[PDB]
């Protein structure tokens, strides 16, 4: 039932959040609120996490393992990194396909909770906005 899902979605979250530097940036009530909303997920190596052109309704914090980003300047994102923010900020479709490189643990943040986070923390909202710009900049360069 729903109770099992709620426990499964949370049971790992606090342990894993220590691996997200972005959230060292948060007041404690804000961090706890966000951690309750996060959902921890493990994705097997090779599996697609988000696909270019599809709608985006969440973003992801990498907490164990790594992902591969298929862009003009391909990159790997490991613990502490994040992806999926661009679609949440622009309302546009996913701009690149991201796949598990090794088996990867992620903390998933749904759009509503991303908006609450950004409305709560100007520092963090700006980090997301600048990260999206950086990534667009990387894409623009051969
Ligand atoms: N377009 C692009 N996305 C990147 C890059 N590096 C990491 N990503 C992430 O891959 C994500 C794909 O989905 P989004 O467009 O929502 O957000 C994207 C970024 O968070 C990059 O160089 N270019
Ligand atoms: Na769920």
Curated annotation (Swiss-Prot):
Residues reported in the UniProt entry to bind 3',5'-cyclic AMP: 84-85, 94-95, 135
Listed name of the protein: Cyclic nucleotide-gated potassium channel mll3241
Entry's localization field: Cell membrane
Species annotation: Mesorhizobium japonicum (strain LMG 29417 / CECT 9101 / MAFF 303099) (Mesorhizobium loti (strain MAFF 303099))
Function summary: Cyclic nucleotide-regulated potassium channel activated by cAMP.
Cytoplasmic side: 3-142
Subunit annotation: Homotetramer.
UniProt family annotation: Belongs to the potassium channel family.
